[PDB]
Amino acid sequence: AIVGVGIDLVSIPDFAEQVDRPGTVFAETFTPGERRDAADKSSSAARHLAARWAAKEAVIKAWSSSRFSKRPALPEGIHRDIEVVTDMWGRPKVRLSGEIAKHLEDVTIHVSLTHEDQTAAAVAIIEEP
Amino acid sequence: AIVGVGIDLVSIPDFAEQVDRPGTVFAETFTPGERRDAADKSSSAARHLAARWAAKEAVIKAWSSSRFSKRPALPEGIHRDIEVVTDMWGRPKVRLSGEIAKHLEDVTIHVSLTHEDQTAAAVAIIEEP
Amino acid sequence: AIVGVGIDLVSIPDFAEQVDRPGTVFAETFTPGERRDAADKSSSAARHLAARWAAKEAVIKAWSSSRFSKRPALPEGIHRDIEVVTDMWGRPKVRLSGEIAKHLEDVTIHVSLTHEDQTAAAVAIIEEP
Ligand code: NI
Ligand code: NI
Ligand code: NI
């Protein structure tokens, strides 16, 4: 059965404006170099980092709505415990660590991401047999 | 198995333009006060009501494409029979009444919504064991 | 279980700019007449063809991420082998031919599409019992 579903839409300009601020949730996710690059909204880096961000958000939303979430407020370091990386063809891959990793060992996480010029989006489906 | 899938994209400005017109499908959904608020496209109310609207649409699309739909034209008062509300953390919740409620008693409806500044979106998955 | 998931976002203006170029992937999909129409970004044709395009892309992404894909690079004529058509109510329908048709005989493909004025989107879920 499906465990949780998440969708996220990212304004690429709003992302560029927020991405390169110290100690943001982005800083736990992306390197300082990546965030500097992505601060230019016209850049390839902004488009692809914003889609990576949408994917992570979508995954967190699916988690939030699921039975693995107890309190309504996200736990500590959910943002370090969930990573979404892309292969050299831009296909996303979910990587778990910490408590999330242990808790979600027996569930599958499906994720897809996309972007146009102004907007990025992703969908996540958490699923179990 | 999955019963039906739906996605919906809402222009927040186009929504603001349409939301506050008498006897629209919106009027069956949202209060006059909510619709007045949402008629300003720059408002928090427009952004969040448009995402609520996208969610409801996504759910109706999933229903339309499913075996629970006979005629291609939507039934009477589908719009009163399906409600999507948000908690104080903005997490959506589906509420059914009328015929839809009776018909869909044994199926789960997963829904997720999101918005940026100009656009809102939602996904719905209807699913059964 | 879910076999593969895909989401796609299409800039309707960028689509109009690309859709009517000879020997593009679009040319394998849509007729010359359809592509001429869709080259005007303000047109109904651009909006609906771009949503049809998003759907096909979403389906291909779901396929790419699935076990039915061996090499990371898409196979020959994936674009002729997968078709997404719309009924007169604008509900999408997947049509398979060639190798894809044979390979995916026992899996279901769920698809949904949508558009606003500037943007189109679709989601695809490939699923098996
Ligand atoms: Ni890109
Ligand atoms: Ni909001
Ligand atoms: Ni249309």
Side-chain angles (χ1 to χ4, degrees), chain A residues 1-70 72-129, chain B residues 1-70 72-129, chain C residues 1-70 72-129:
Chain A
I2 286 158
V3 163
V5 173
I7 187 172
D8 196 50
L9 201 65
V10 174
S11 165
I12 299 176
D14 295 349
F15 179 80
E17 174 71 17
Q18 298 304 312
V19 67
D20 188 35
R21 302 199 181 214
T24 51
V25 276
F26 315 102
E28 280 173 19
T29 309
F30 310 121
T31 72
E34 283 180 314
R35 300 198 282 110
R36 269 187 306 266
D37 297 335
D40 175 7
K41 64 204 178 86
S42 59
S43 70
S44 204
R47 291 188 297 263
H48 293 120
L49 225 77
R52 264 179 71 201
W53 182 252
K56 176 168 181 145
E57 290 284 86
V59 176
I60 287 166
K61 268 151 112 163
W63 180 91
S64 275
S65 76
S66 87
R67 70 170 179 262
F68 291 109
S69 180
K70 273 76 187 190
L74 300 179
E76 169 68 53
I78 187 98
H79 280 99
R80 278 180 311 258
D81 282 21
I82 300 174
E83 155 180 35
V84 174
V85 296
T86 48
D87 69 10
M88 11 202 77
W89 303 265
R91 291 174 313 185
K93 231 74 173 73
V94 182
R95 292 190 178 172
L96 302 183
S97 57
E99 288 296 85
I100 305 292
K102 287 167 135 56
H103 286 281
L104 260 69
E105 152 90 6
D106 302 306
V107 308
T108 300
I109 309 179
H110 314 273
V111 65
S112 185
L113 50 68
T114 183
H115 75 79
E116 51 96 3
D117 231 68
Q118 291 313 302
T119 290
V123 67
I125 308 183
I126 305 176
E127 178 199 39
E128 63 180 357
Chain B
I2 286 158
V3 163
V5 173
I7 187 172
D8 196 50
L9 201 65
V10 174
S11 165
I12 299 176
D14 295 349
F15 179 80
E17 174 71 17
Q18 298 304 312
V19 67
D20 188 35
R21 302 199 181 214
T24 51
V25 276
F26 315 102
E28 280 173 19
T29 309
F30 310 121
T31 72
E34 283 180 314
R35 300 198 282 110
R36 269 187 306 266
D37 297 335
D40 175 7
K41 64 204 178 86
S42 59
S43 70
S44 204
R47 291 188 297 263
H48 293 120
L49 225 77
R52 264 179 71 201
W53 182 252
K56 176 168 181 145
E57 290 284 86
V59 176
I60 287 166
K61 268 152 112 163
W63 180 91
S64 275
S65 76
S66 87
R67 70 170 179 262
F68 291 109
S69 180
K70 273 76 187 190
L74 300 179
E76 169 68 53
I78 187 98
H79 280 99
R80 278 180 311 258
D81 282 21
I82 300 174
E83 155 180 35
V84 174
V85 296
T86 48
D87 69 10
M88 11 202 77
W89 303 265
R91 291 174 313 185
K93 231 74 173 73
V94 182
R95 292 190 178 172
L96 302 183
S97 57
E99 288 296 85
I100 305 292
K102 287 167 135 56
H103 286 281
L104 260 69
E105 152 90 6
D106 302 306
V107 308
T108 300
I109 309 179
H110 314 273
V111 65
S112 185
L113 50 68
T114 183
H115 75 79
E116 51 96 3
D117 231 68
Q118 291 313 302
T119 290
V123 67
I125 308 183
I126 305 176
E127 178 199 39
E128 63 180 357
Chain C
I2 286 158
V3 163
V5 173
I7 187 172
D8 196 50
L9 201 65
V10 174
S11 165
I12 299 176
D14 295 349
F15 179 80
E17 174 71 17
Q18 298 304 312
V19 67
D20 188 35
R21 302 199 181 214
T24 51
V25 276
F26 315 102
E28 280 173 19
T29 309
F30 310 121
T31 72
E34 283 180 314
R35 300 198 282 110
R36 269 187 306 266
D37 297 335
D40 175 7
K41 64 204 178 86
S42 59
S43 70
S44 204
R47 291 188 297 263
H48 293 120
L49 225 77
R52 264 179 71 201
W53 182 252
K56 176 168 181 145
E57 290 284 86
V59 176
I60 287 166
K61 268 151 112 163
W63 180 91
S64 275
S65 76
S66 87
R67 70 170 179 262
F68 291 109
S69 180
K70 273 76 187 190
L74 300 179
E76 169 68 53
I78 187 98
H79 280 99
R80 278 180 311 258
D81 282 21
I82 300 174
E83 155 180 35
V84 174
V85 296
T86 48
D87 69 10
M88 11 202 77
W89 303 265
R91 291 174 313 185
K93 231 74 173 73
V94 182
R95 292 190 178 172
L96 302 183
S97 57
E99 288 296 85
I100 305 292
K102 287 167 135 56
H103 286 281
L104 260 69
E105 152 90 6
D106 302 306
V107 308
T108 300
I109 309 179
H110 314 273
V111 65
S112 185
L113 50 68
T114 183
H115 75 79
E116 51 96 3
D117 231 68
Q118 291 313 302
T119 290
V123 67
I125 308 183
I126 305 176
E127 178 199 39
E128 63 180 357

